[PDB]
């Protein structure tokens, strides 16, 4: 594929983990996108190597 990845994304603010798969992030944290189906997108974190369910409000695509 392409060399540049832009499936990165920044935290606009902390996230709340209210399950066992979703990830409460900081804000201005890194997150990856991994799927983009329904209101909710799961992700993963690149600094802590971990992956959970994260809002599309708090995490836009990097410009």
């Not at 409460?24 to 799927?35: A, S, V, Y």
């Amino acid at each position: 594929g392409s060399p540049l990845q832009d499936n990165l994304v920044i935290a606009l603010h902390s996230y709340e983990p209210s399950h066992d798969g979703d990830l409460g992030f900081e804000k201005g944290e890194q997150l990856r996108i991994l799927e983009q189906s329904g209101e909710w997108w799961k992700a993963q974190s690149l600094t802590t190597g971990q992956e959970g369910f994260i809002p599309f409000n708090f995490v836009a695509k990097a410009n």
